[PDB]
Design a protein around this motif. Structure first.
Motif, PDB file in Angstrom:
ATOM      1  N   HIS A  14       3.099  -1.899   4.476  1.00 56.57           N
ATOM      2  CA  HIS A  14       1.989  -2.560   4.870  1.00 56.57           C
ATOM      3  C   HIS A  14       1.290  -2.169   6.225  1.00 56.57           C
ATOM      4  CE1 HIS A  14      -0.227  -5.484   2.971  1.00 56.57           C
ATOM      5  NE2 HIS A  14      -0.747  -5.853   3.933  1.00 56.57           N
ATOM      6  N   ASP A  15       0.401  -0.983   6.371  1.00 54.71           N
ATOM      7  CA  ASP A  15      -0.092  -0.572   7.658  1.00 54.71           C
ATOM      8  C   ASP A  15       1.240  -0.021   8.499  1.00 54.71           C
ATOM      9  OD1 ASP A  15      -1.336  -2.356   5.878  1.00 54.71           O
ATOM     10  OD2 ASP A  15      -3.164  -2.317   7.281  1.00 54.71           O
ATOM     11  N   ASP A  16       2.058  -0.941   9.096  1.00 56.21           N
ATOM     12  CA  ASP A  16       3.116  -0.680   9.919  1.00 56.21           C
ATOM     13  C   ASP A  16       4.034  -1.758   9.813  1.00 56.21           C
ATOM     14  OD1 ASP A  16       4.478   0.344  11.907  1.00 56.21           O
ATOM     15  OD2 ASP A  16       2.797   1.195  12.831  1.00 56.21           O
ATOM     16  N   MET A  17       4.735  -1.940   8.843  1.00 54.21           N
ATOM     17  CA  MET A  17       5.793  -3.281   8.725  1.00 54.21           C
ATOM     18  C   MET A  17       6.987  -2.543   8.293  1.00 54.21           C
ATOM     19  SD  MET A  17       5.824  -6.309   9.658  1.00 54.21           S
ATOM     20  CE  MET A  17       4.589  -7.595   9.917  1.00 54.21           C
ATOM     21  N   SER A  25       0.712  -1.085   0.005  1.00 57.74           N
ATOM     22  CA  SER A  25      -0.029  -0.075   0.127  1.00 57.74           C
ATOM     23  C   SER A  25       0.864   1.062  -0.189  1.00 57.74           C
ATOM     24  CB  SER A  25      -1.002  -0.049   1.046  1.00 57.74           C
ATOM     25  OG  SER A  25      -1.804   0.875   1.214  1.00 57.74           O
ATOM     26  N   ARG A  26       2.105   1.075   0.447  1.00 54.99           N
ATOM     27  CA  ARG A  26       2.953   2.341   0.495  1.00 54.99           C
ATOM     28  C   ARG A  26       4.616   1.812   0.150  1.00 54.99           C
ATOM     29  NH1 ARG A  26      -0.573   6.587   3.364  1.00 54.99           N
ATOM     30  NH2 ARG A  26       0.712   5.796   5.166  1.00 54.99           N
ATOM     31  N   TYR A  27       5.335   2.578  -0.015  1.00 58.33           N
ATOM     32  CA  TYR A  27       6.711   2.229  -0.598  1.00 58.33           C
ATOM     33  C   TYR A  27       7.565   3.592   0.088  1.00 58.33           C
ATOM     34  CZ  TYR A  27       7.578  -2.087  -3.052  1.00 58.33           C
ATOM     35  OH  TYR A  27       7.645  -3.437  -3.197  1.00 58.33           O
ATOM     36  N   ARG A  28       8.563   2.946   1.114  1.00 57.80           N
ATOM     37  CA  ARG A  28       9.422   3.837   1.554  1.00 57.80           C
ATOM     38  C   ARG A  28      10.904   3.885   0.852  1.00 57.80           C
ATOM     39  NH1 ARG A  28       9.789   5.763   8.321  1.00 57.80           N
ATOM     40  NH2 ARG A  28       7.997   4.487   7.626  1.00 57.80           N
ATOM     41  N   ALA A  79       3.460   6.668  -2.635  1.00 56.28           N
ATOM     42  CA  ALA A  79       2.399   5.352  -2.616  1.00 56.28           C
ATOM     43  C   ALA A  79       1.998   4.797  -3.919  1.00 56.28           C
ATOM     44  CB  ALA A  79       1.286   5.926  -1.921  1.00 56.28           C
ATOM     45  N   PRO A  80       2.502   3.699  -4.171  1.00 55.61           N
ATOM     46  CA  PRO A  80       2.271   3.010  -5.589  1.00 55.61           C
ATOM     47  C   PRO A  80       0.826   2.227  -5.549  1.00 55.61           C
ATOM     48  CG  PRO A  80       3.780   1.802  -4.313  1.00 55.61           C
ATOM     49  CD  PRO A  80       3.652   2.817  -3.547  1.00 55.61           C
ATOM     50  N   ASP A  81       0.511   1.603  -6.550  1.00 54.08           N
ATOM     51  CA  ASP A  81      -0.989   0.929  -6.548  1.00 54.08           C
ATOM     52  C   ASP A  81      -0.694  -0.713  -7.013  1.00 54.08           C
ATOM     53  OD1 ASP A  81      -3.152   0.145  -7.122  1.00 54.08           O
ATOM     54  OD2 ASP A  81      -3.917   1.603  -8.270  1.00 54.08           O
ATOM     55  N   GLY A  82       0.269  -1.016  -7.740  1.00 46.08           N
ATOM     56  CA  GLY A  82       0.271  -2.279  -8.328  1.00 46.08           C
ATOM     57  C   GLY A  82       0.616  -2.270  -9.523  1.00 46.08           C
TER      58      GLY A  82
END
Length: 94
Positions: free
Chosen positions: A76-79, A30-33, A49-52
């Motif tokens: 992913h939410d918080d990983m 859901s997001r890319y750092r 924030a990519p989508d796929g």
């Protein structure tokens, strides 16, 4: 749950413009750092924030022409999945 990426690739790298593409973590993130550091200017944090369908990035607006230490990390939410490193040489002005 995430799946951790493996190895990233590069499309067009230039002292002032670089295109990179990493492998999706087979878990639709859901997001890319994406952070990139350098022995001089310092490091920066990217939040695209990519989508796929967009599994790459556009580092347009640099300056130096040396090896930039970039780190692509899926989210992913918080990983904190394995941080994928991307050491590429910014094509100097040849």
């Amino acid at each position: 749950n995430i799946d951790r990426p493996k190895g990233l690739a590069f499309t067009d790298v230039d002292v002032d413009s670089i295109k990179i593409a990493w492998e999706s973590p087979q878990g639709q993130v859901s997001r890319y750092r994406v952070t990139y550091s350098s022995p001089e200017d310092g490091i920066h944090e990217l939040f695209p924030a990519p989508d796929g369908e967009e599994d790459t990035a556009e580092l347009q607006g640099l300056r130096p022409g040396s090896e930039y230490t970039v780190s692509v990390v899926a989210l992913h939410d918080d990983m904190e999945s394995q941080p994928l490193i991307g050491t590429q040489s910014t094509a100097i002005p040849a």
